[PDB]
């Protein structure tokens, strides 16, 4: 299952560290996170970004499994990750939701609303809880950018990243973007940096 | 039906507290139940200071505050502006202003 093409390359590593995607929250962290690496003074835990990357790959592998990638919703309402969610969307099929979720989207079959996805990715599970609540009415799996303090309730695969910072959210979306196509088409050459730039997702 | 989890007000773990007297009403009320508020104000109202500024000898004289702590019974506190009826879900909040 696990080849070394997807090992964490040290040039991939410097991408993550520049964003501070490895800085967990303070004295707050859900018991449901062993994604932690041993923590620093000044209270901040350092995520084990190896666990990030392995979860991100599986994330990608679950997305590629979606037959018609058009219906894969990816959600932000978070002021930050809105910009990056839309960029992610155009790359794969990936119906996007930025701004306000407008409840009634997964239940409540009326048009000018209502995608019926088979998968859903969320920037902040706390701040996008309407989708994660709503998804649990309709047999829809959830993928989440959990930080150390983030609810694991109804979220199915957690990507431990640092959700309390500018670049850290954008990085994962683009890396998740890059990975889901490194699995069929564009960027066939793994270990060859994708044409695209990360700084676009901000 | 029980209206508040604090029963009346804020006493868990003793059994008996002791009574204070409403400043407006004189009614007995347990200290934990009284409605408390500090009247920290200067001895001068709006204006009347720079109408007293050059009225004073002592170039350098600060302004002494007049301190007094006030306890209200429930009924008075409600009948003045002190507390107000709140909604059901609004009664759980401890934000002063």
């Amino acid at each position: 299952s696990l080849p070394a093409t997807f090992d964490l390359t040290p040039e991939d590593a410097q991408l993550l560290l520049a964003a501070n995607t490895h800085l967990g929250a303070r004295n707050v962290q859900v018991h449901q996170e062993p994604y932690v690496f041993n923590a620093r003074p000044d209270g901040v835990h350092v995520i084990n970004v190896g666990k990030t990357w392995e979860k991100l790959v599986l994330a990608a592998r679950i997305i590629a499994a979606i037959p018609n990638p058009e219906d894969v919703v990816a959600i932000s309402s978070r002021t930050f990750g809105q910009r990056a969610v839309l960029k992610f969307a155009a790359h794969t099929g990936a119906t996007p939701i930025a701004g306000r979720f407008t409840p009634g989207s997964f239940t409540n079959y009326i048009t000018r609303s209502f995608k019926e996805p088979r998968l859903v990715i969320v920037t902040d599970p706390r701040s996008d809880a309407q989708a994660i609540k709503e998804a649990s009415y309709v047999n829809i799996p959830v993928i989440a950018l959990t930080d150390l303090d983030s609810p694991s309730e109804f979220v199915d695969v957690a990507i431990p990243c640092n959700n309390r910072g500018k670049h850290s959210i954008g990085l994962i979306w683009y890396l998740l973007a890059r990975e889901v196509l490194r699995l069929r088409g564009a960027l066939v050459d793994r270990t060859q940096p994708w044409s695209i730039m990360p700084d676009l997702y901000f | 039906p029980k209206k508040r989890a604090s029963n009346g007000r804020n006493k868990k773990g003793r059994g008996h507290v002791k009574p204070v007297r409403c400043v407006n009403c004189s009614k007995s009320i347990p200290k934990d139940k009284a409605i408390k508020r500090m009247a920290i104000r200067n001895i001068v109202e709006a204006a009347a200071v720079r109408d007293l500024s050059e009225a004073s000898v002592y170039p350098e004289y600060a302004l002494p505050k007049t301190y007094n702590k006030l306890h209200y019974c429930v009924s008075c506190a409600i009948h003045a502006r002190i507390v107000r009826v709140r909604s059901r879900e609004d009664r759980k909040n401890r934000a002063p202003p």
Binding site: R40, P41, V46 | -
Partner: protein, 121 residues
């Protein structure tokens, strides 16, 4: 007294999405523009769509108004994407080639990978 209802506000922005091609900051021009392309019943009806469409225009210059799209808002609003690309990509530049990391943040590295600009605190 003077609060325009959704009959005007919907119709008034119903135009600006399809005719920002043309349209002006002057009322009487849009007045005689309206009835060419619209089917308003009364003059007072049309003169109030026009008075508001013009009002949206007299303010359209400085920032788009919530709920608008006119083939050019989409164009120009895209132009401010990638302000920083074509300069430093935030790798070893704005940094001294070194990645400045702390004592325990660093121990996390020796776990699997090794190629690393180092630091301490």
């Amino acid at each position: 007294g003077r609060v325009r209802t959704k009959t005007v506000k919907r119709a008034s922005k119903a135009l600006i999405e399809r005719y920002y091609p043309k349209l002006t900051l002057d009322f009487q021009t849009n007045k005689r523009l309206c009835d060419e392309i619209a089917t308003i019943q009364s003059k007072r009806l049309r003169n109030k769509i026009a008075g508001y469409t013009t009002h949206l225009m007299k303010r359209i210059q400085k920032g788009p108004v919530r709920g608008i799209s006119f083939k050019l808002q989409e164009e120009e609003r895209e132009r401010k994407d990638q302000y920083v690309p074509e300069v430093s990509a935030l790798d070893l530049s704005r940094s001294n080639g070194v990645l400045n990391v702390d004592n325990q943040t660093s121990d996390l590295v020796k776990s699997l990978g090794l190629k690393l600009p180092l630091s301490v605190i």
